[PDB]
Amino acid sequence: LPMPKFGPLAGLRVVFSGIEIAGPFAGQMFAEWGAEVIWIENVAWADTIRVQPNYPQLSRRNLHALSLNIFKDEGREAFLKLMETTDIFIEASKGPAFARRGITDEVLWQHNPKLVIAHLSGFGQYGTEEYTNLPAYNTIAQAFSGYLIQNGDVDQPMPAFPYTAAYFSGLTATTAALAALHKVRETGKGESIDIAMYEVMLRMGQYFMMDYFNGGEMCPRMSKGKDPYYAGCGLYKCADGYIVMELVGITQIEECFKDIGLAHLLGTPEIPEGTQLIHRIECPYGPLVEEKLDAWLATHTIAEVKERFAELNIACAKVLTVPELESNPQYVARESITQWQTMDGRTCKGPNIMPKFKNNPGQIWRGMPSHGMDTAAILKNIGYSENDIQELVSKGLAKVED
Amino acid sequence: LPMPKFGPLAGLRVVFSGIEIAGPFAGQMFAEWGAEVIWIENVAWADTIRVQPNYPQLSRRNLHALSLNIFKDEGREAFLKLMETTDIFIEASKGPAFARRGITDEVLWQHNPKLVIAHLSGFGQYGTEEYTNLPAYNTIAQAFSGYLIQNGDVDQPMPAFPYTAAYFSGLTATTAALAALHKVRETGKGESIDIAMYEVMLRMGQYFMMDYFNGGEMCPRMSKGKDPYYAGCGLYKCADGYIVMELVGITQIEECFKDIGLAHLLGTPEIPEGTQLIHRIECPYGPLVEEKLDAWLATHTIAEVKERFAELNIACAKVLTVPELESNPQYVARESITQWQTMDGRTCKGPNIMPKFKNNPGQIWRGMPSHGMDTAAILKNIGYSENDIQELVSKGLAKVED
Ligand SMILES: CC(C)(COP(=O)([O-])OP(=O)(O)OC[C@H]1O[C@@H](n2cnc3c(N)ncnc32)[C@H](O)[C@@H]1OP(=O)(O)O)[C@@H](O)C(=O)NCCC(=O)NCCSC(=O)C[C@@H](O)C[N+](C)(C)C
Ligand SMILES: CC(C)(COP(=O)([O-])OP(=O)(O)OC[C@H]1O[C@@H](n2cnc3c(N)ncnc32)[C@H](O)[C@@H]1OP(=O)(O)O)[C@@H](O)C(=O)NCCC(=O)NCCSC(=O)C[C@@H](O)C[N+](C)(C)C
């Protein structure tokens, strides 16, 4: 299929079946980095993402579009021929839906013994009858993993946003596939990978949860963007708006205490000389620390705080709003935000490829394709006759091609 | 170095320098999957994570511990010998700190032309003088990327939690390194990777931000855990506690409207027959929808809602608290939470390896090592004499070994 040769993944053949964020995100990351990536959509329906007015232009770029009923007679027979040339297949469904419908890993490996198979689901490929076959979205994975309960204010739990768990899960699928791809080069044998969204999110929520699993208490939720345990960490207000900061390190603490008027606290039994973090709940002086930090910050502008925090090696930043991003000199300097052309010739704006590969940078070579745009070009590459693909179209096995 | 042969990454040699979450997380994921992973700590100081009472037992497991002043005379000379046997090196610092201190990518490639180098920083390896060399933590990356402003309640922005951006950045580093590792096998030439935390997070926040970049408005923040745009999506309350749900799909909407008493809305100009999502702000009936959903949900228990939502293929889940995770039958069935022994022989509880590799599952083979635990065993493997390592210890170039 005609495509520029670029990125660390040039000439890798990746195929994905899935809607919305998680599976498509996993597959599309391959295409950001120069892989040949085929997006499978249903025949009668199309990927739900297409309902979004702008995002899909970013989230489906560099992709080739396919419409095949991958479960029916000849539609199934081509999917399996396709799999013989594919290095990596990502599928996102309700549990072992592929296996239930006949496309086992064993069936897939009969067509390609080397194939890497990444299964993405809410609850896993196996488990109990109650959960294994349930549908899931980001929010369901946040709820079930204990991530949701950790987010929000003291009195109001809420999801991390936008759709955080869908990005973690898709990114994990990309990572695990690439690791499995490595193993295939070493041994010539394929792999199957069972990525459960709740299990991904369980991991991402362990920083304090590990306290609960090993004798401790669980942490509370943040109060108004402030770290639940650590003073001087999180959302603060200066004289002229919100900043973030992290009071971390021996020197940072010594010098910051001196500024806010707490010099005399340094060297006491509960704050000995090598102290690199202050726990707000364990420390009787924790609230005092907050009171003085808050009071000292409200006196200074964001610019004055930044200048002094730079002198002390204290990490901080202005809380930026979306309209402030484009003109930020760091963004401009690094071309963090760029433009490209859509398939119909409009100009599209949004993030550049990330991260930056030095020797083999990714690039944007195609806009989002339309439903089944390349279904006819792929089936013909897979050896199917000109008439043969006309017969797939008619029987409703292959679709759109508009 | 003595270690079991397992996982898709068996026999891969990975080295990382970094503290807290982001860099160490990137490097440790390799070890979850059977790579030989060397953790570098400073000589006089030790990784800040060690201050946490339990988490490091999970986040530093399967690792080999090294203490070398990687910038001083002979300490530097060994780091570079080590690099000659290393496949992947992950470093997390303030911008191009390694280059500034003399360890360029060019210097590194003179020792190993194949080496994959992953640079993790807040603001990138290059940019403007104002930002490029600034320190960063999760919160700084959330602030600078527009992610922070998207999280929280209508009136109160707050970070996604716990330390969300540190996990995305580290996971991206793992992914990018594995992709670059692939390219080395294809061409025999190494790679350098520039992972800026704000650029990672910019990507993860694009779902609605793409509206702003292309003519639209930016979305508001959630109100009490409810999707800012889409009715029937997010945090809801049943008669006996919090659930999440996603009203998505043609059938799901038709049948749910019928239940909540909104049957008559189906088929109107603004809700035509194929409607798969309802936008709450664009739709005059959006608030009505919420009012009826809320009212119908408050009548039913979580169990009754789940049973009916299963009948209709509507994704949902109980919002679980941490103490509910261990005994969940899906968790138990999949061994999502497991136990292992620490280096000093205590029993440790926490998440199992994720995801599940079928043919080559990861495993937990070692607890977190102590500071410099393996520094003497690594230097001797790298060819340094028994006396030679005694001279490194004394001059303060190599440390702990306790
Ligand atoms: C799709 C899904 C989310 C549940 O929806 P569904 O039951 O309507 O399934 P479907 O894919 O739409 O298609 C229904 C049937 O259609 C079949 N099908 C799908 N593609 C096909 C093809 N090419 N050929 C033949 N059959 C095909 C499927 O196998 C399936 O058959 P089954 O009933 O036997 O399972 C399910 O795939 C699933 O749970 N996947 C795992 C987790 C996952 O990736 N979910 C998405 C997370 S991303 C996310 O959270 C974003 C979201 O929150 C944002 N928003 C608020 C806007 C919605
Ligand atoms: C460490 C860092 C976070 C800023 O701290 P620092 O300035 O104190 O740097 P350091 O690593 O502690 O060491 C200071 C010096 O010590 C040197 N050094 C470090 N290791 C060495 C070695 N082995 N040999 C010789 N020198 C060594 C460093 O090069 C460095 O020299 P420089 O001043 O020339 O830059 C910086 O590495 C950085 O910004 N990294 C990139 C982003 C990153 O990974 N940050 C962590 C995100 S994870 C996260 O967000 C978790 C956190 O939010 C949770 N909590 C609330 C509890 C804190």
From Swiss-Prot, chains A, B:
Coiled-coil regions listed: none
What gene name does this entry carry?
caiB
Q: What is the effect of changing V184A?
A: In strain: O44:K74
Q: What pathway does this protein act in? A: Amine and polyamine metabolism; carnitine metabolism
User: Which Enzyme Commission numbers does its entry carry?
Assistant: 2.8.3.21
Q: Which UniProt keywords apply?
A: Cytoplasm, Transferase
- Give any extra note attached to this record: Some strains of E.coli, such as ATCC 25922, can metabolize carnitine under aerobiosis.
Role description: Catalyzes the reversible transfer of the CoA moiety from gamma-butyrobetainyl-CoA to L-carnitine to generate L-carnitinyl-CoA and gamma-butyrobetaine. Is also able to catalyze the reversible transfer of the CoA moiety from gamma-butyrobetainyl-CoA or L-carnitinyl-CoA to crotonobetaine to generate crotonobetainyl-CoA.
Protein's name in the database: L-carnitine CoA-transferase
Give the InterPro entries listed for this entry.
CoA-transferase_III (IPR050509), CoA-Trfase_CaiB (IPR023452), CoA-Trfase_fam_III (IPR003673), CoA-Trfase_III_dom3_sf (IPR044855), CoA-Trfase_III_dom_1_sf (IPR023606)
What the entry lists under Pfam families is as follows: CoA_transf_3
Compartments annotated for it: namely: Cytoplasm
**Active site positions:** A166 (nucleophile)
Q: Name one GO molecular function term.
A: L-carnitine CoA-transferase activity
